[PDB]
């Protein structure tokens, strides 16, 4: 998925947030890795993406 720059802390177990609660929820016993990288070059437009 694609999120904001400040919302990368919310992709974690047990977090209270808007995308955490209503978009993507992680379990408390989650195992694995979260990968986040900037996509300004591809997922942004000057007029607004």
């Amino acid at each position: 998925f694609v999120i904001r720059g400040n919302e990368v802390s919310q992709i974690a177990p047990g977090q209270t947030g808007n995308i955490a609660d209503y978009n993507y929820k992680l379990p408390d016993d989650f195992t694995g890795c979260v990968i986040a990288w900037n996509s300004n070059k591809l997922d942004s437009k000057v007029g607004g993406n």
Binding site: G14, Q15, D28
Partner: protein, 49 residues
């Protein structure tokens, strides 16, 4: 005269009182009440408390 028997009674009640008193001990946590810990913290740190 009857110090020994009373002592046994004295020990037993005191032990229960001490055990009950131990419920009011933070034990290095923010609060001694489980409901407050659940109502105030996220599960990653609430689990620790």
């Amino acid at each position: 005269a009857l110090g020994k028997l009373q002592d046994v009674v004295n020990h037993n009640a005191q032990a229960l009182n001490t055990l009950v008193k131990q419920l009011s001990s933070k034990f290095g946590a923010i609060s001694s009440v489980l409901n407050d810990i659940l109502s105030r913290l996220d599960p990653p740190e609430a689990e620790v408390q």
